[PDB]
Amino acid sequence: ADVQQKLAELERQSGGRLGVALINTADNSQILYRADERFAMCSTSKVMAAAAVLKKSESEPNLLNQRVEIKKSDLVNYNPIAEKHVNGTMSLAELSAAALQYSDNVAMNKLIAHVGGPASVTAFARQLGDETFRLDRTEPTLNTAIPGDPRDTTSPRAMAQTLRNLTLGKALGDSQRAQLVTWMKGNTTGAASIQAGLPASWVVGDKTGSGGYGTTNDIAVIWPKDRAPLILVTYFTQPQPKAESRRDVLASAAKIVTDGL
């Protein structure tokens, strides 16, 4: 109740809507705040698209080495790695890494297309037991984050359970799970989000998201010093279409729910 009051006051001071789900795998306990409400995932959905391709590679183990053509017609507002390879190719490994470590939008769209489109990423989520996740659109429009629009949304509870199953559980094969964790740990962006509310000694594998209405998100797997890992989802969105990002709100929520660990 004390943690709940602190998250409510954080949300009130911030002016927006906050969703939090923490899973502590030491005892399977959870801290939940608006954890069954829907939030626009924005780029946090790149984790699911990358994982869907990893799952496919369990049936096609050379898949990450397969080449994908990059063309000018593919470019979608933000693509710092793919634009280097226009009229050339990238491997599915390179596209996964670019999506997860640079949030490259072309990379996301190639991962979505590879498995068959947004509805196929949603079908992958359903196969993991996630009935909440829905991917409806490609980049860049999946980031509109309009209040009330369920497209490209999930809930903090559902995303925390799915990220647990992907990064720590058995949703993926052992080598695929290791590859996903390697990519997320190697993502050094996001230091101002969940990680900024944690002790510097803790190891974090995260993916941030940002979109319209000042939407500011982060999902993470966290290895605290001398502790079993945590899964933390922090979603935040604001009433004004042109609101600026609030990465610090996610850092604050992370500090509140991990205090004492």
């Binding site: 780029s43 017609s73 507002n77 710092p80 280097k84 949030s103 042109k242």
Partner: protein
């Protein structure tokens, strides 16, 4: 400070790697990794990354020259006047001059610009990002924008999102 639009504009095609770093500030820049032998310079936090420039060079040599300039959220359009109607007036096969007169001389910024035969302009490829009156943001999500791309000064394709 970090990488800026003013630094991007000061950097010219034909400059050496070290001339680029002189202007950009090497504390902002990196090479290798996902960027190969290009030089990638970070500006301010924006979206899920940073506003940035990427500079490509004629070779890996220490004194190679800039033949490619790309940027995201370093440059604002000087007078954005793009509309959905003006976007629909653009046609594949138009020249660059025809496109700019259609969408507005202040509506676009240069997303990427590459001279594969530098200093020759043969084969030049160009991507413009063009914006309606309030579509550009240097930090957050675009609210009405278009991608127009060219080879040899001829429009090869166009795409738009959220224009009205």
């Amino acid at each position: 400070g970090v990488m800026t639009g003013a630094k991007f504009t000061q950097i010219q095609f034909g400059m050496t790697r070290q001339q680029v770093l002189d202007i950009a500030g090497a504390e902002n820049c990196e090479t290798g990794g996902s960027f190969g032998d290009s030089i990638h310079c970070r500006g301010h936090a924006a979206g899920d990354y940073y506003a940035y420039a990427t500079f490509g060079f004629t070779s890996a040599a220490a004194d190679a020259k800039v033949d490619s300039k790309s940027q995201w959220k370093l440059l604002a359009p000087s007078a954005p006047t793009l509309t959905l109607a003006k976007f629909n007036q653009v046609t594949v096969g138009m020249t660059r001059a025809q496109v700019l007169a259609t969408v507005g001389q202040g509506s676009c910024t240069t997303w990427s610009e590459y001279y594969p035969a530098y200093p020759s302009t043969a084969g030049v490829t160009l991507s413009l990002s063009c914006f309606d009156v309030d579509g550009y943001s240097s930090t957050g999500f675009y609210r009405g924008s278009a991608h127009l791309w060219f080879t040899d000064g001829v429009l090869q394709g166009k795409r738009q999102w959220d224009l009205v």
